[PDB]
């Protein structure tokens, strides 16, 4: 019975790392893109100076 | 005395069933009382899960 319950809990907790974890993966890539689109203009003006 | 061992030992063989009769009954009885208790328990912990 110990196992059964152990089943149901490890489930829901999975689905829900399992979202988490995909939703902090694309907001980390949108703040990646950011960065780097930052980097790239800081650089630009920096060599043109 | 030796008549009287020869029955005593008739009675002592008696005492000895009773005996093993309540020592298993009250073992086996508080024995399936947890186990009973325990398994409302563990069904009750599934549905908690659930």
Same mark, same amino acid.
């Given at each position: /019975? =110990?196992?059964?319950? /152990?089943?149901? %809990?490890? &489930?829901? &907790?999975? $689905?829900?790392? $399992?979202?988490?974890?995909?939703? &902090? ?9 950011? %960065?780097?689109? =930052? +980097?790239? $203009? /800081? +650089? &630009?003006?920096?060599?043109? =100076? | 005395? !030796? @008549?009287?061992? *020869?029955?005593? *030992?008739?009675?002592? @063989? ?8 309540? !020592? ?11 186990? @009973? ?5 563990? @069904?009750? !912990?599934?549905?908690?899960? *659930?």
């Amino acid at each position: /019975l =110990k196992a059964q319950a /152990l089943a149901i %809990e490890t &489930e829901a &907790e999975l $689905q829900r790392v $399992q979202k988490v974890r995909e939703l &902090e993966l694309v907001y980390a890539r949108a703040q990646l893109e950011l %960065e780097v689109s =930052k +980097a790239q $203009q /800081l +650089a &630009e003006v920096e060599v043109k =100076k | 005395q !030796s @008549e009287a061992e *020869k029955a005593r *030992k008739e009675l002592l @063989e008696l005492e000895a069933l009773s005996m093993a009769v309540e !020592s298993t009954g009250t073992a086996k009885a508080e024995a399936e009382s947890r186990a @009973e208790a325990a398994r409302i328990e563990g @069904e009750g !912990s599934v549905l908690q899960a *659930k």
